[model samples]
Target chain A: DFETISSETLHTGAIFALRRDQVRMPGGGIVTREVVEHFGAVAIVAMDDNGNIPMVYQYRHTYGRRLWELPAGLLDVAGEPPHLTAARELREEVGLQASTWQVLVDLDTAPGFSDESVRVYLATGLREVGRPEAHHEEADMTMGWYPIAEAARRVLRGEIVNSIAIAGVLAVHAVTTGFAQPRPLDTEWIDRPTAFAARR
Target chain B: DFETISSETLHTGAIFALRRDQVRMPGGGIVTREVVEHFGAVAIVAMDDNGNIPMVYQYRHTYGRRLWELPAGLLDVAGEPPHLTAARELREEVGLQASTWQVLVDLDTAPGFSDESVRVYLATGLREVGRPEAHHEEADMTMGWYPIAEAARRVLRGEIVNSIAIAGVLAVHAVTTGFAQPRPLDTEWIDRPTAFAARR
Candidate 1:
C-alpha cells in the first residue's frame, strides 16, 4: 500500500543503502523518508480438498525461538520466474511438491523503504517429495500441516506472527473466501537458445 | 506470515541497523535474515462517510519529492504509545480534531528488518480548529480531503504507490464495508473526574 516517489543511496561504511524520499501528499509536500535493502521472495499456502493445509515450524534468530509459518523463501539470485520461484520455495521449505498451483497475491513487502516484492501462491494436490535440501546454515529444520481455520485463528490471536506468512495466509484466505481475486496466469513464454543462455 | 526468532544490532555509521533472523521451518535449522534501520513510522486513513479522506502533503527526504499520503508520523522514542502518537500526528499533519476515533488496523510495514508498525485509524466528526503546528522542518505543508475510492483505485493501479497509505485505505474500507468491527470505546470515562476536568 505504501508508495515511493524517489530515492537516494546512502553509504554508511560497509553498507551501501538506498534511502527513498517520499511525498506524503498529492500536492507536492514531502513526508519522511525511509531506507532499506531489496529482497525478492515467495510464499505458499498449500492446501488439500479435505481442508488440510501445509505449514512449517522453523527457528528464527530475530525472535529467538521457533515459530510456525507458511512456507516461504527468497528467490534465487539467478532470477527464477515468480512461478518457478514459488514452486522451488514450496519444495525447499516444506519438502512437498504441488501438481496444481496458482498465484494468489503479489506484494511489495515494503514499498515505503525497500523494493522487495514477495509473491504468494496457493498450491493444491501436494505430495511428499523428499526431505528439504537444507542449506549449510539450515541443516536442522522440520515441517508439518495444520487446519486452515485454526491457523487463521492463531494468526489473528498473534500466535502466527510472521509478516510474509501472515500476508500469505491472508492472501490465500481472501482469495478462497471471495474477498479478492487471484492473479491470472499468462501462458506466453519467450524462447532463448541454450548456447546464448549459458553464455550470458 | 513470516516470523523472526532472533535479531542483532548492526551499527553502520549514522544509521541504527537491525538484522532479524527468521526460521522458515521449526527446530533451529534453515535461517533467513532481514536487515533494516531502526527509525520508521505509521500512517492513518482518516475518513468521513461523505467519501472525503484526509491526507497530508510533505517533503520526504528519502524520495526527494512531496507525495500524498494518509496523515502519518514517526514514533518519537521508546515506550511511546501508538494511539497517543496517532492523535498527535493527526493534529500536526492535518490540523483536524476528532471527537471519535478507533484503531482500524495494526500492521508491520516492514517485518524483515525494522520493527515499524503502521496503525491506521477510522476518525470521524472532524472539526478544523486552526492551522497545524508542525515541526520546524515540516512548516511548509498542506492538507486536504479527496474522494476515498478514487485514491484507493490509484493505489491499486500503482499510481498511488505508498504501502502504508494503501493498507490504511484498505483498513478503512474493511471497517466501512463491515468486514471488521469497530473498536469498543471506554464508557467508564463518562463518570470519571478526568473527563469533567478536560471539558471544564
Candidate 2:
C-alpha cells in the first residue's frame, strides 16, 4: 500500500466533497489523485407478490434527463443503518413497504475516483404505504412497475442504465433463476465507505 | 424534463469536473444539484478458453484501500471508441488480448450525482500479449484469475464489490448459463456521457 503524504479538501457540497491527496508510490514517486467523497447510499429492489419491481424515474441534473433507478437514498440521517434507510426510501419514493428484506448485492459505483458504496437490498412481500412528503427532485419523481424478466431485458437493452438498478435487477434475476442466492439482511458489507461517514 | 437556469463549474481536474446547477422543478420551484462530470470509461470481462476471468487489484485513493476490479480505463483519448479503450486496457492491465468482443452491459455509475457511464464488454478467444509500459498507480497493480462460477460466488460473498466487475461477472454468468445473450460489440449506448467528451 502507498503512503499518503498529505490531503486537502478541494470542494465541499451538500452530499459530497472532493479532495486531493499526495501519495507516495511504491517506486518512491509521488502522485496526486483527486477523489470525491460521498455519503454512502442504499437502494432497494422491491418486488411485489405479483412479480413486479418498483422503479422510479426522475430528472437527474447530471445529464439533464430522467433515468430509471431503484428506489435509493443517501445515508444523510445520522446514525441510521443502511437497511433502515432502504426501507424509508422505498416508502418515500414509491409508496411501498416490504415485509421481507435480504442483501442482494453491494457495489462501489465509481471505485476509480469516488468512494460511493451502494448496498442494494432485495425486498419482497410488498404492500402499499402512504406516500410521504417529498421536496426537490423526489417531489416530481414518477414510479413504474416492470416484471422481473422485463426489467432484466431492459437492462440488457440499455433502457435501465443506472448502475444500482442494473445490478439489483440482474442480481434478483440470477437468484430467482437459481444462479445464486441472496445473503441475509445483515450480511457484512466489506467495502462500504466509512471515511466520509466518520468525518461527518 | 427540468430546466437548467444556471450552471457553473466548481472545480476542474485531470479526469473529472464538478459543477453546480440550479434546475427548475415541475411546480415552478428551483433546486440546486452538485454534479461530477467525468469521461466515460469501459471494462472488459476477458474470459479465456479455460473459463477464467482476469481481474485486477489496485489501490484506489478514494477508499485508501485496494479493490478487485475488471480491466478498465477512461475514454480520455480523443476520438477513441469505448471498445478500443477496452481492448487497450485489457492489454495494458492484464497483458492479454481477445479475438471476440460483445457488449455485456451499459451502466451510469452514479446517476444521482455523476454523469459517469461505464460500458462493459465480454471478451473471449484470449491470447497472451507483451506487457506494456506502466506508470503511476498502474505500475503497482496486480492481476488475478478466477473461474467464472467462483467469481460469481465471490460477488455474492461480498468479496468482489466494484460495480463494473460485479455487473460484468454476473452478466457473463447469466449469459453463459442460458439466461440471456450479449449484444453486438457496437450496441448503442443510450446514456453514454457525451457532455464531458464533447467538451474535451
Candidate 3:
C-alpha cells in the first residue's frame, strides 16, 4: 500500500499550512513531496430556474488579474460539510442560495503535493438575498449573470480561467446537454482523501 | 495599484517553493496570501488524424493512486517557452510528436495563492516515436488512446479527474465539433503572464 512514512509541518497558517511528507512506494522506496496543506474548498455553479448562471469579477492575487469565476470559498469553516460551504459561498460571494444541490465533480488542485481540492455543486432554484459583507478580495467583487451557453463559451475562449469555474460550468453544461448526469449531492469525493493531510 | 508589500520564502524544493507575502489592496490595507511558487507547467490533448486522444495512467503520490491524465509536465526546465514544454511532455510522457499545436487554454490552478498554472495545447497530426526512458512516476506509466467522444464522456464521468485532462479533452471536443476555433499555438497565455514574479 502507498503509505506515509512521516509528515512534518513546515509552517502554519489559517488559510493553509506547509508540510513535508514522505510516501512509501511499491518497492519500499520512500519519496518526499512537500505539501501545501489546505482546508479544501467548495464552489457552486448556481443555475437559476431561468437558465442563467451568476458570477463575479474580482482581483485574484495569484494571477494578479481579475477573473470572472463562480462563487467559491475555502473549507476553513470548521466542522461544516461541503454542501453547506457551497451554499454559504454562493450566498457570501454571489448573494444567493439554492434549494437544490447536485454534486458536479471533485477538483484536485495541484494534487502533486497541494491537496487543495474543492467539491463543485450544481446549485439550482436560486433566490436572491441582499449582499455579502465583502471584505478584502470580496469587497471589490462585481457581479454578473449570463446564459449557460455563454458561460461555456467563455470557458472555451479562455475568458474564464478560474479552475473551479471552468470545470464546474463545463461539467454543468455537459449534464444539461445530456453528456452526463448530476451525481447525488452526498456522493463522496474520492480523489482527495484525508490520508496524508496534516491539516486540522 | 495592487502591489506586493513583502514576500518571504518559507521553504524551497525541486518541486515548489513556499512563500508568505503581503499585498497592498486598492484601499491601502495590506492582506497576506501565502503562496506555493511553482515554475508553472504545460499539458496536451494529442489528437491524431484519426481523431483519437492518448493518455497515461501513473501513480500520483499525492492521491496515492494511478490517475488517467493527458500528457502533462512542469516547466521546471527554465527558459523554455510554453509550447516547447508542451511538445516535450507529449514526447516524454506519451512517446509521440505532433505536427500541429494550438494554444487551447491557459489554466490557473489555484489563483488564491498557488502560482502554479498550465498551458493546454491541442496537439494534432501525431506520430508515435516510443516513450522516453521512464523513471520514478514516469516508469510506471501506461498509455492508451480513446475517441474524442469517449474521452469527453470519461471526463464527465470522473474517470478522468486531472483538471487539465478534463478541460483539455472537452475543449478539443468543442473545437473539433465546431463549437470553437483552436487558437494560434503562440497566442499569448493571458492568465499566466510571462512577465513578473520571475522566480520571486
Candidate 4:
C-alpha cells in the first residue's frame, strides 16, 4: 500500500511530526504524507479456563465513545518487543496475570498508512493480581470478563464497538474454533480474518 | 483518533490534497496534518450452497510476493458505497456473481495513518459468468474454492496469509456458525464472536 517515500521532521512546540513524499503507481502519481507521532501497541484476548474473556471498558478519543475491547495499549518506548508490552497491558489494563501466553498474530492495525502494529496474544491461566495500575488518563477504566460468544455477538451487532476488541475477539475465535492456526515464528503472513480467507 | 481539527485544500501539481491542523489533548499540543492520495477497496467471500469458499491469488506490492486473498481492489473513485464496490470486485477478481450479499464488516484497515476503509461482504449462491477482464497487473491471477472450515483453519494457522482473506473468512464463519448474528439496519450494536468448548 505504501509507495516510494521521503521524510522531513518538524516540531511544533512540544509535539513532533513527520512529513513524507511518496510516489504512487498504476499511473505514476505522487502524493505527500503527513503523519502524527505514534507508538506501536499490543492487544490480547485473555481467555480463562471456563472460556470467559477478559476485557476493558474505556474511553477512546478517536471513536469518541466508551467502548469495550480486549486489554490493549501502545508500547512505552521505541524498540520494545510487543510481547512485553502485551504482558504489561494485561496486568495494567485488567489486573490479571497469565501463566501461559503465545502470540497469535501481529497486524499492522492500519497498514495502508500508519506504522502502528497491534500484536495480539492468546493468554490463558489467569489469576487476580490486585488492582489495575492505571496510567494517568486510563484511571477511570472498568475491567471484567464476559462470555466470548456474547462479546463477539455484541461487537458484530455494533454493541461492543472498538477496533481492537473486534479484531482480538475474532482472532481468538479463529484460533480456538480451529478456524485459524498458529503462525510459525519466522514466517510473514496476513493474520487478520478476511486476508487469510483469500489465500489459495 | 482525531482531536479538534481544521482543514484546507492545497493544490500539489495537478492533484488536490488536504492540509489539516489538529489540537492535541491534555497538553494543548498542536499538530499539522497531511493526507496522501489513496484508494478505498472492497472484498467478497462468495460462498456456495455446499459451503465452499471462493478465493483469489494475486501479487501484493506491499508484501513483495504473490499471495492468496479474497477478491478485492481499490475503487476507481471516492464516496462510492463499498457494497457496490464489492459487487464489482467479485465480478472482476473472481467472475462469480452472488444473488444474496450481506456486508460482513467495514474496517479501517490501517487506522493509525491511512483513512482507507476496506469493506467485506458475505455472498451466497454464486454463479460464474466468464473469465474476468483483469488489469494487466492481475492478468496472471487465479481463482478457486475451498471448504469454508478448511479455509478457516489454514487462515488461523497463517497458511492462508493475506489480511483481507483472513478477515473475510472469519467473518463468514462467524455468520454461518451462528457465532455472529446480523445487526438490524441502523442498530448501534454489532455482532462479535464467542468461544465454546468442543462438544464431546
Strongest candidate by lDDT: 2
DockQ of each: 0.15, 0.73, 0.61, 0.17
Write one digit per residue (lDDT tens) for candidate 2, span B1-200. 48889988898888888889988887788878888888889999998887899999988877778889999999999898789999999999999989999999988899888988899999999999988889878988898999988998888778888899888988888777777888898678877777666665
> Which residue pairs of candidate 2 clash?
none
**lDDT of each residue in A71-157, candidate 3, tens digit only:** 898777667777887887888888897888888877776767676777788888888897757777788889899888889899888
Cα lDDT, all candidates: 0.55, 0.87, 0.79, 0.58
Report chain B TM per candidate.
0.72, 0.97, 0.91, 0.77
TM-score versus the correct structure, for each prediction: 0.65, 0.95, 0.93, 0.72
lDDT tens digits, residues A159-200, model 1?
554555655564455445555554444522111112111222
Interface RMSD of 2: 1.3
Q: For residues A1-200, what per-residue lDDT tens digits would candidate 4 score against the true structure?
A: 33655554432211223324453534344555444334556788788988789887775433334567678866644555666777877887788789888767665443333344456788889987966445433665677778777777665655553455666677777666755554433444342222111211
List RMSD in Å for every model shown: 9.1, 1.6, 2.3, 8.9
In the range A1-200, model 2's lDDT, one tens digit per residue, is 58889999998788888889888887788878888888889999998877789999977878778889999999998889889999998999999888999999999999888888999999998889899788878877888999988998888778888889988998888877777888898788766767677776
Kindly list the per-residue Cα lDDT of model 4 for residues B1-200, writing each as its tens digit: 33656644332222222233453544444554443233556678888999898887665433334566788866544555556777877887788788887766655453323344456678877898775555433665687788888887765655564555666776777887877754322332121111000100
Q: Model 2 misses residue A78 by how many Å?
A: 1.2
